[PDB]
Amino acid sequence: IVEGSDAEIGMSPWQVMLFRKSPQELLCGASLISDRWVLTAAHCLLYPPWDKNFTENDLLVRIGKHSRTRYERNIEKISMLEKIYIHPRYNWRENLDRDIALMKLKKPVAFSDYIHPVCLPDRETAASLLQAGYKGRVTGWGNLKETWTANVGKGQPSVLQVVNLPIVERPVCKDSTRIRITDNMFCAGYKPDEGKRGDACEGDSGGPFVMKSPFNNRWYQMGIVSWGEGCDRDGKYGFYTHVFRLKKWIQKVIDQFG
Amino acid sequence: ADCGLRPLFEKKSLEDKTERELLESYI
Amino acid sequence: DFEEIPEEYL
Numbered sequence: 103i104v105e106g107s108d109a110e111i112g113m114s115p116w117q118v119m120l121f122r123k124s125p126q127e128l129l130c131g132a133s134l135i136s137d138r139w140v141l142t143a144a145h146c147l148l149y150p151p152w153d154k155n156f157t158e159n160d161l162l163v164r165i166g167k168h169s170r171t172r173y174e175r176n177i178e179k180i181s182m183l184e185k186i187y188i189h190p191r192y193n194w195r196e197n198l199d200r201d202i203a204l205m206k207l208k209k210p211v212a213f214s215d216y217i218h219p220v221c222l223p224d225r226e227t228a229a230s231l232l233q234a235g236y237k238g239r240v241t242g243w244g245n246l247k248e249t250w251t252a253n254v255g256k257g258q259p260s261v262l263q264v265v266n267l268p269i270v271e272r273p274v275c276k277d278s279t280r281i282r283i284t285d286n287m288f289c290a291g292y293k294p295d296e297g298k299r300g301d302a303c304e305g306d307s308g309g310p311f312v313m314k315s316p317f318n319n320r321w322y323q324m325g326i327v328s329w330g331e332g333c334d335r336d337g338k339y340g341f342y343t344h345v346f347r348l349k350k351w352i353q354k355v356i357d358q359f360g
Numbered sequence: 361a362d363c364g365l366r367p368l369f370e371k372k373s374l375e376d377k378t379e380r381e382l383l384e385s386y387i
Numbered sequence: 388d389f390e391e392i393p394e395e396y397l
């Protein structure tokens with residue numbers, strides 16, 4: 103996360119870490135959506151241009167964390183994967199369209215002060231909240247500045263970072279880039295004239311973009327961190343997988359394993 | 361069911377340090 | 388970087 107802050111403890115207790123077993127690495131962010139289901143970006147697992155194709159035994163899920171690097175001994179929970187599910191029409195060949203995956207945990211996690219699921223949107227929450235100018239919140243342990251294209255200053259956070267970003271009009275999203283923007287995406291971030299800034303960045307992929315409902319005071323996941331060009335570049339925006347538009351597929355896999 | 365209600369925040373009616381920014385933007 | 392995690396997780 104670029105230009106964010108340290109998260110408070112328990113502020114984002116659905117945040118999950120995707121952690122590689124060997125060599126041990128943070129791969130990406132992710133989200134806890136029930137006691138045995140995690141939501142992430144499909145590109146975290148499957149990206150054939152780079153010969154990236156993770157399978158269940160490749161990976162650990164770490165839940166309840168604050169510190170990026172330590173083993174948070176009686177706080178975090180580490181889980182094994184039983185099944186990975188990537189969307190059948192994820193488009194890795196051109197634009198990362200439908201960039202979503204479900205992972206089912208070997209055993210259900212127990213909830214705690216630090217571990218608690220986020221809600222998924224329904225039609226009318228999506229309708230009411232997913233609007234331009236409304237801010238949501240992104241979290242993660244990824245780089246503090248841009249990246250591939252690598253960087254200086256600080257690099258990697260000690261602790262979970264937060265940033266809050268406004269949603270941007272679809273026209274300005276499509277006019278900031280040459281990539282084909284689909285309906286399964288939205289973009290977020292501040293405009294170059296607005297004076298605030300901030301963004302996700304590498305290693306933040308796969309985590310939650312969340313909004314708090316003003317009707318029932320709950321947190322809902324509206325987006326998954328998917329892609330951007332650079333990180334926190336003027337007149338560039340971050341692109342997120344639109345979670346309500348892929349919800350049929352999510353319900354499909356959870357109901358029928360379940 | 362209790363999704364989206366955080367043990368340390370909503371469940372004890374404490375706010376986090378920036379959640380007002382979100383809520384203020386919803387008109 | 389990463390602290391070592393317990394062996395029963397591998």
Ligand SMILES: *C(=O)[C@H](CC(=O)C=C(C)C)[C@@H]1[C@@H](O)C[C@]2(CO)C3=CC[C@@H]4[C@](C)(CC[C@@H](OC(C)=O)[C@@]4(C)C(=O)O[C@H]4O[C@@H](CO)[C@H](O)[C@@H](O)[C@@H]4O)[C@H]3C[C@H](O)[C@@]12C
Pocket residue numbers: 145146149244250251301302303304305306307308327328329330331332333334339340341
């Ligand atoms: C997640 O951590 C990260 C997404 C974000 O950070 C989100 C925001 C900033 C909002 C992910 C990461 O998981 C890996 C990416 C996704 O798969 C990733 C990998 C390789 C990139 C990428 C697919 C975007 C296209 C292209 O980059 C650009 C800028 O066009 C690509 C294929 C790449 O090779 O990177 C580019 O590298 C630079 C400098 O060497 C060069 O100028 C470009 O010509 C070259 O294409 C990318 C998407 C996503 O953001 C990533 C980083």
